[PDB]
Design a protein around this nucleic acid. Sequence first.
RNA 1: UAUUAAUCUAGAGUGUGGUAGGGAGUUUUGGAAUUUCAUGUGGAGCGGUGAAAUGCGUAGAUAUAUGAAGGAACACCAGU
Length: 114
Amino acid sequence: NVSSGIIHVSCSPNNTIVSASDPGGNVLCWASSGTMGFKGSRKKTPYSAGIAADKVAKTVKEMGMATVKLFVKGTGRGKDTAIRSFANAGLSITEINEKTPIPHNGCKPPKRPR
RNA sequence: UAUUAAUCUAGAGUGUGGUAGGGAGUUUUGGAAUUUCAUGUGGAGCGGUGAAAUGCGUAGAUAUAUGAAGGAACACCAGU
Ligand SMILES: [Mg+2]
Ligand SMILES: [Mg+2]
């Protein structure tokens, strides 16, 4: 019922999440590899990110929006498969801003696995 | 060479004149980010791994938007 809005696409190294939201807060719908039915290790594969983007794009397109600002997030591997999925869905991508949290040397990160 | 009586400025210092620094201590100040809490939207997983399982989640989590509190460390500049 709204023309413009925001779709946050977080890409963790282990999973991915695509949240379609109002231009300010108030998410309208959300989807993830887990809710699709994919389980375990497969949830971290670029193909799954594209699949998740496709379902949320179809759902949100029937709701009737055109202009999308795409706030890319995370540091996974399928960060662009979802991007191409939305473009092939045909929504009007207006911005490609990236907002992955970067620290300015605050908080000590965890130990190195070996 | 050592001792003593003295002279000199080139060794080393002092002053004047230029001058580069994340040199140190004390007292204040700032923004991201994490965590917790508060308020909305939302509706089934999130999390983790070589693969999983403990764990967290319909008491509404992850996510998204705003605010508050608090502690720690000071991205880029930053380097033949
Ligand atoms: Mg680790
Ligand atoms: Mg805040």
